[model samples]
Target: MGPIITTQVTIPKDLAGSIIGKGGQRIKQIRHESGASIKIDEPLEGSEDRIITITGTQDQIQNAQYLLQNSVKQYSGKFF
Candidate 1:
């Protein structure tokens, strides 16, 4: 609608592990589901988290965040 919006968030590497899946395929799925551009980089050397950036309009960005958290929620689904 207006200007492209970008936001940055940090997620623990352990959590991001699922989001990235094998060869970043999961993240690619997230982008499609959320209608947003998702960017990831190498985690900091000693940090337990990685920086993730989402670029899109407000709706898309929020959708991305929602799907991301949903991914986290399903993180515990393997056992139950």
Candidate 2:
């Protein structure tokens, strides 16, 4: 088995709600589908970005990150 890993990503605060979905359904789906635990930190004061942490095996973490990037692009019409 591989060691667990962690990664961090930041997305526009405007996109947070889309990633989270109504009632947090989107993030929940990402977590379940990617097999990674995802934690989204609150946006800092006066900032328009939020930090998201992902934890899992390397492959799982990468998969989760990929999904998030895609979701963000789909939600905001931009890529990061």
Candidate 3:
């Protein structure tokens, strides 16, 4: 593969809660499946959304994003 890279995706607070879940073993699953390093940024004052920082190859980043996407969309009540 190529050199490692990094990117961040912005997501709503509720979405983060859904994906991260209680105990957050779910995020650990994403890391394992995607072979990437991923982290959630702590909320900023007055902010309703958070940033997800990802590091690894493009393939790694891609799968992780997809994994997170499904995790969130699954929990969402389709209000979006």
Candidate 4:
């Protein structure tokens, strides 16, 4: 059993396409890989980034963040 946690991530506007994938498949992949509950806010008009909320145990949250961060980096660059 891992501790529950709450963390947020910002997605780059340019790479939102990749991170979200077609039909949000990519976002689902992130949730699965991280083992955390993820909620990605739809990009708002004129918003700079997207906000993703992950809720789980401390460990799970960390893992989720790691997975998501790495994925984002692959597309855009370093951001944490």
Candidate 5:
């Protein structure tokens, strides 16, 4: 396996639930499909956005990033 890489993605607070899905299904799907580990951070004390960190091999990380971004688009009807 390649060395692991990490990327942080920030999304609007309002859209966080959409990516997480009703029962965390959407985020789980992203992990299953991308072979990446993702951690969605709790909302900051006074921020209006959330940070999601993804960790995996280069290919896996890329796949996860794409899926996460796509999920945001699908959930919000707008590109991330």
Candidate 6:
């Protein structure tokens, strides 16, 4: 089997807050739906950016990214 490939998804700081929901419920949901491990980074000091990382098989990672992209688009309509 080939090595897994990871993908990153960046969400606007404002929209990131919504995706992460309280205690990261939203991120958790995405992980569940995508069947991949997901890591969401909080806005860093002096940086109002959020980064979501998914690691898994190439296909799995792609699927996660696809789901995440759609979820973000759907969750924060017109934000992208």
- Scored by lDDT, model 4 comes in at 0.76
Clashes of 4: 5
For all candidates, what are the clash counts? 0, 0, 0, 5, 0, 0
List where candidate 4 sits over 4 angstroms from the true fold: 77-80
Candidate 1: list runs displaced more than 4 Å: 77-80
Best by lDDT: 2
- Work out the TM-score per prediction: 0.83, 0.88, 0.88, 0.75, 0.88, 0.74
- Tens-place lDDT per residue, model 2, 1-80, is 49998888888787777679888999999999999999999666346788899999999999899889888888888877
lDDT score at residue 74, model 6, on the 0-100 scale? 76
> Candidate 3, residues 4-73: lDDT per residue as tens digits?
9999987887668766866888998889999999999986633777889999999999999888888888
Q: TM-score of predicted model 3?
A: 0.88
Comparing 1 and 6 by lDDT, which wins? 1
Q: Report every candidate's CA lDDT.
A: 0.81, 0.86, 0.84, 0.76, 0.85, 0.73
Candidate 6's displacement at residue 64, Å, is 1.4
**Candidate 2 wrong stretches, greater than 4 Å:** none
C-alpha-based local distance difference test score of model 5: 0.85
Worst 10 residues of 6 by lDDT: 41-50
Compose the digit string of candidate 4's lDDT tens values, residues 19-77. Answer: 67778888798888777898878667457877878898888888877777777778677
List, residue by residue over 1-80, the lDDT tens digit for candidate 1.
66789998777776777678887888999999888999987776447777889999988898998888778678844311
Total clashes in model 6, counting residue pairs 3 or more apart in sequence or in different chains:
0
